[PDB]
A paper describes a structure:
We have investigated the role of the LC in the structure and activity of two neutralizing cattle antibodies (B4 and B13) that bind the F protein of bovine respiratory syncytial virus (bRSV). The F protein epitopes recognised by mAbs B4 and B13 are conserved in both human (h) and bovine (b) RSV, and are a major cause of lower respiratory tract infections in young children and calves, respectively. Both B4 and B13 are potent neutralizing, fusion-inhibiting antibodies and protect mice against hRSV infection and calves against bRSV infection. B4 recognises antigenic site II (residues 255–275), whereas B13 binds to an epitope contained within antigenic site IV, V, VI (residues 417–438). Exchanging the LCs between the Fab fragments produced hybrid Fabs: B13* (B13 HC/B4 LC) and B4* (B4 HC/B13 LC).
The H3s of B4 and B13 are of different lengths, comprising 21 and 25 residues respectively. Both contain a pair of cysteines, at positions cys97-cys100G (B4), and cys95-cys100E (B13) (Kabat numbering) and structures of the Fabs revealed that they form disulphide bridges irrespective of the paired LC. The two loops of B4 H3 are of a similar length with the N-terminal loop contacting the CDR3 of the LC (L3) and the C-terminal loop interacting with CDR1 (L1) and CDR2 (L2). Viewed from the top, the antigen binding regions of the two Fabs show differences in both shape and electrostatic potential. Both Fabs have a negatively charged cavity surrounded by positively charged areas, but the B13 cavity is much bigger and the negatively charged area is broader, consistent with the fact that the two Fabs bind to different epitopes of the bRSV F protein. For B4 a large portion of the CH1 domain of the heavy chain was disordered, including residues 149–153, 169–179, 198–215 and 222−233. The area of the interface between the variable domains of the B4* Fab is lower than that for the B4. This analysis shows that amino acids 100E to 100 L of the HC in the B4* structure have very little involvement in the interface except for Gly100 G, which is completely buried. In the B4 Fab structure, all of these amino acids are involved in the interface with ≥20% of the amino acid buried. This string of amino acids at the interface in the B4 structure contributes four hydrogen bonds, involving Cys100E, Thr100 F, Gly100 G and Glu100 L, which are not present at the B4* interface. The Kdapp obtained for the F protein/B4, B13 and B13* were 84 nM, 125 nM and 234 nM respectively.
Numbering used by the authors:
A (entry chain L): 3 to 212
B (entry chain H): 1 to 148, 154 to 168, 180 to 197, 212 to 223
Write the structure that this text describes.
């Protein structure tokens, strides 16, 4: 396996580069290719051999090789470059890949988390089960913490929360669920989804009266 | 244009055989090599094997005892079978079109002009004993008084599902659930809503 830095950071417009370290039997012997992978999507080849660009790949992307290390450079970082990057070549009898680098775009301003907390439905309670859905949208950075309350008391019973995601606006999103029974939702008077974000709580609450 | 489509069961039980087919179009397998690679969740890429335009099959020696790859130019298909699977074989499986009939190295690398010029979309195959479950979907509204819609595709298996949609969560029930900011589509369950 070729070694790549786990992450590289830069702000918009900066020059950033990503290295790929191997040996004389791979990077030292063969050309080196690079693949771009946007989170959730597939793969795209952006550089091959030395610094060749497939059609459609802008000239901001370039590559070079020095000894047993290959370097992928973005001369001016843009927002659509936030993705993972993998180097690729061959060894004696196998294909080898780099361990991958997440390219992080830093220097962004903060945004408040939009929380539309929803109660379950009449079909769910007729099948005696309650699914509280706490959706969180548009915040930077992505390190929010959600604490559920039942009339003002901590809850860790049946709490699953997707970690910080990334849609398409250079921000982060997350969803949290409360998979409790029918009586458990009808018992208490009010449940709340308390979301923390850099020292800011945006609590929402619907009570079973409606 | 050029297109590569991965097909096969996306949920296989451990110890069974995982089989996939890549059907290609827009180009002839007599002209270009085709590679299979996979990416386990949150991990890097792993090479499975290559199938050159001359019928030569190159394997990852770490997987050769379980791996078989076949190439049918007449049907424009390159297939893979992987037996004796375990959850370590859960991955997104990609086929890929090489720019040449046979590259100097493996997985379409090596010499000048040799690169993957078209990637498949990938097919996530989950290795698990769970049963294929079509999701129970409901609407999500907040009609409880305010001074001011989402979907509830819950309890399905396996991933993925297609619909601001959120990534799914793995509840303790062993099933997946997600929501969106309604048309949901679970290809493994064959159901549409």
């Amino acid at each position: 396996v070729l070694t790549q830095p786990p992450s590289v950071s830069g702000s918009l417009g900066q020059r950033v580069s990503i290295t790929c370290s191997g040996s004389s039997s791979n990077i030292g012997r063969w050309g080196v290719n690079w693949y771009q992978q946007v989170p959730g999507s597939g793969l795209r080849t952006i550089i091959y051999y030395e610094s060749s660009r497939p059609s459609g790949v802008p000239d901001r992307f370039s590559g070079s090789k020095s000894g047993n290390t290959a370097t992928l450079t973005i001369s001016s970082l843009q927002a659509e470059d936030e993705a993972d990057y993998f180097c690729a070549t061959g060894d004696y009898n196998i294909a080898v890949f780099g361990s991958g680098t997440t390219l992080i775009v830093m220097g962004q301003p903060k945004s408040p988390p939009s929380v539309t907390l929803f109660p379950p439905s009449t079909e769910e309670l007729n099948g005696n089960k309650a699914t509280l859905v706490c959706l969180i949208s548009d915040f930077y950075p992505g390190s929010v913490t959600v604490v559920w309350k039942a009339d003002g008391s901590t809850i860790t019973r049946n709490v699953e929360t997707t970690r910080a995601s990334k849609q398409s606006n250079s921000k982060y999103a997350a969803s949290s669920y409360l998979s409790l029974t029918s009586s458990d939702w009808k018992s208490k008077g009010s449940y709340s989804c308390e979301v923390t974000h850099e020292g800011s709580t945006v609590t929402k609450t619907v009570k079973p009266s409606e | 244009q050029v297109q590569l489509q991965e097909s096969g069961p996306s949920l296989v039980k451990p110890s069974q055989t995982l089989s996939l087919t890549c059907t290609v179009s827009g180009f002839s397998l007599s002209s270009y090599s085709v590679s299979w690679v996979r990416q386990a969740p949150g991990k890097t890429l792993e090479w499975l094997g290559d199938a050159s335009n001359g019928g030569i099959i190159y394997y990852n020696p770490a997987l050769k005892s379980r791996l078989g790859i076949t190439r049918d130019n007449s049907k424009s298909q390159v297939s893979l079978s992987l037996n004796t699977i375990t959850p370590e074989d859960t991955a997104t499986y990609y086929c890929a079109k090489c720019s040449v009939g046979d590259s100097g190295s493996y997985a379409c690398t090596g010499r000048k002009g040799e690169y993957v010029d078209a990637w498949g979309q990938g097919l996530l195959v989950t290795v698990s004993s769970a049963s294929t479950t079509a999701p129970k979907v409901y609407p999500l509204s907040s009609c409880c008084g305010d001074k001011s819609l989402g979907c509830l595709v819950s309890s399905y298996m396996p991933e993925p599902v297609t619909v601001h949609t959120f990534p799914a969560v793995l509840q303790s029930s062993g099933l997946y659930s997600l929501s969106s900011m309604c048309n949901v589509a679970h290809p493994a369950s064959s159901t549409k809503v």
